[PDB]
């Protein structure tokens, strides 16, 4: 069934599972035409497929060529997402295939169920959590690989860097969602928090800075302050 706060620890058990977020698959800018009508221009997107236990991120880059000459693109984007997730599952060895796929948006349920008919034992589930995975394109190295792509491409990342050497998956996912929520709420301030100290760098093979345990505590507090600050600005509290 649906995944919520009551069954949250299930994300970190030993049954392989993936979150699939489709919010950055079909990305457009809207603009005026010479005649004063409005048109869209697509930009490259991505499917965000994440194992919350291990941090493995299967970033399938969606190149704008896949939309060429197609109609009803927002509908097609859901089906293309489900096609690519299905292809990913088929590409994995049996013992790496997920037992559950959790979609962050309920509109993905039917497209994914239909593409996964050959896998009747993989449960397709919605979630009641509001997850900030749309903000994945605020992570500079992910945004860069998506924008530079000239063709469809899959790029593998560990979205937790090396954090699991020191903290549990539950804590790593909590840190990830806090960082992404902060980047979604006020991207400029969140990035300023993450880079404010030149002496802390991002390793070539990492996405986030190399903070010590104590610095992560400070950073996490600053991210919570940002989220609360923005909440007060929004609602005049």
């Amino acid at each position: 069934g649906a995944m919520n706060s009551s069954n949250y620890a299930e994300l970190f058990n030993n049954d392989i599972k993936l979150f699939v977020d489709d919010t950055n698959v079909y990305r457009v800018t809207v603009h005026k035409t010479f005649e004063g009508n409005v048109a869209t221009k697509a930009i490259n997107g991505c499917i965000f497929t994440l194992n919350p236990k291990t941090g493995h991120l299967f970033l399938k880059i969606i190149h704008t060529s896949v939309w060429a000459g197609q109609k009803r693109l927002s509908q097609l984007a859901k089906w293309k997402t489900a096609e690519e997730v299905s292809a990913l599952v088929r590409s994995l060895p049996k013992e790496e295939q997920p037992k559950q796929i959790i979609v962050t948006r309920k509109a993905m349920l039917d497209p994914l169920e239909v593409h996964m008919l050959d896998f009747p034992n993989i449960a397709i589930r919605p979630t009641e959590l509001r997850l900030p995975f749309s903000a994945a394109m605020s992570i500079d190295k992910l945004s860069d690989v998506v924008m530079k792509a000239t063709e469809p491409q899959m790029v593998l990342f560990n979205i937790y860097d090396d954090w699991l050497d020191r903290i549990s998956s539950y804590t790593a996912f909590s840190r990830l969602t806090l960082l992404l929520r902060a980047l979604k709420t006020n991207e400029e301030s969140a990035k300023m928090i993450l880079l404010s100290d030149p002496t802390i760098t991002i390793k070539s093979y990492h996405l986030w800075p190399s903070f010590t345990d104590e610095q992560w505590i400070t950073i996490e507090s600053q991210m919570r302050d940002l989220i609360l600050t923005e909440y007060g600005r929004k609602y005049n509290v």
């Binding site: 489900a82 497209p111 169920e113 239909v114 593409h115 008919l117 050959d118």
Partner: protein, 300 residues
């Protein structure tokens, strides 16, 4: 015109014959139904006065044998039986008719309702949905489950309607996932019509039989099948024109026939709103839309 005599009527019961019904009192001198129109299937159905649980009944065709009803006090129901002795049967009917112990099938001459509801319904197809090969007539009741309902429990007592499932490998060609899910034409035309049913007449016959079992017995699985077969057509972009026009007629008379007060339990809002207002065929069912809009506007 043919006759279904009753040996007797020992328990008070509402008896239906097709769309007609009448009440019989405990031990009333009722000995059957005469003047039944040859050329159609018929259904004789029962709801006991002391226990409205289990509506049940029998589909039959008087061209296939001489049938009568006799109450069984052990199993507690009116049973259809076949009489193989022709002269015995004729002599029974004649005596009961001479003593005017029979009701007459009360068909108005202008009235094509029953033909319109059973146009494509054949006894041979009924006997394949309802499997009891030793009788020429078919028993159905309010509680019988369908093969589909069971998969999701006594298989000898099931309604073997054709399984329709929009999220199944049968309905979705590998590699045509979006296409086949959003446009069910493959599933309708190749899988169902060309493959399983062979032609539209058999498809409509099953659709009509499912409606009738839903209406006369309150059989929930039959209502599910009726709606699924409507939705499969309406959700297909490519349907032969003759089928769309025939479907409009079929549904019109079913909507013409349904008890105004049973609409809440026999009509699926989602299916009907989808079919009339969103589907590919939203503009192909003018007669059905007109009656649905004027008779049941709440549901919509």
């Amino acid at each position: 015109m043919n006759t279904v005599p009753f040996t007797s009527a020992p328990i008070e019961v509402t008896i239906g014959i097709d769309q007609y019904s009448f009440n019989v009192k405990e031990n009333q001198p009722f000995h059957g139904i005469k003047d039944i129109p040859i050329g159609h299937v018929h259904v004789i159905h029962f709801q006991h006065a002391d226990n409205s649980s289990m509506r049940y009944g029998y589909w039959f065709d008087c061209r296939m044998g001489n049938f009568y009803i006799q109450y069984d006090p052990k199993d507690g129901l009116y049973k259809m039986m076949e009489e193989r002795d022709g002269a015995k049967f004729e002599n029974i009917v004649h005596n009961f008719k001479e003593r005017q112990m029979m009701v007459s099938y009360p068909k108005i001459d202008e009235d094509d309702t029953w033909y319109n509801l059973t146009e494509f319904v054949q006894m041979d197809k009924i006997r394949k949905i309802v499997r009891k090969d030793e009788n020429q007539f078919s028993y159905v009741d309010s509680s019988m489950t369908t093969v589909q309902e069971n998969e999701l429990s006594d298989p000898a007592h099931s309604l073997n309607y054709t399984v329709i499932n929009f999220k199944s490998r049968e309905a979705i060609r590998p590699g045509h996932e979006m296409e086949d899910f959003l446009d069910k034409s493959y599933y309708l035309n190749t899988v169902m019509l060309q493959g399983i049913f062979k032609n539209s007449s058999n498809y409509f016959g099953e659709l009509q039989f499912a409606f009738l079992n839903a209406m006369f017995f309150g059989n929930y699985g039959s209502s599910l099948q009726w709606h699924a077969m409507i939705e499969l057509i309406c959700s297909s972009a490519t349907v032969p024109k003759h089928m769309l026009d025939k479907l409009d007629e079929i549904l019109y008379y079913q909507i013409k026939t349904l008890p105004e007060q049973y609409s809440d339990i026999l009509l699926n809002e989602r299916v009907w709103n989808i079919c009339l207002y969103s589907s590919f065929q939203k503009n192909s069912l003018h007669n059905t839309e007109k009656i649905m809009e004027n008779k049941y506007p709440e549901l919509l």
